[PDB]
Amino acid sequence: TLSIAQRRDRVIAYLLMKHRAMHENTWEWMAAQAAQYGYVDVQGQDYPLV
Amino acid sequence: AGLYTTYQLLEVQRKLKTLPAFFLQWFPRQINFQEDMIAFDKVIQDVTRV
What start-end ranges are recorded for coiled-coil regions in this protein (chain B) (predicted)? Predict the structure, then answer.
């Protein structure tokens, strides 16, 4: 029943909501590491460990 | 009496055991259908990543 441009609209709205929620989750993870240990160890494949 | 005994009938004592409704109080929706089967969909949206 969904048109194929409508499916594109659905997946685009879903991805934008997912980016918003992932940035808020990164804020939560940094706040938790700041509260417990006093040192956050930011890592990643595209980011050297500091 | 002579040929037999006289009787009086009182009220017919009756008992009607029912199994009343307990578990159907959580099943409110009623669906009638002439199709074969009833299909569902289930979607998990894993937001909680960093």
Answer: none
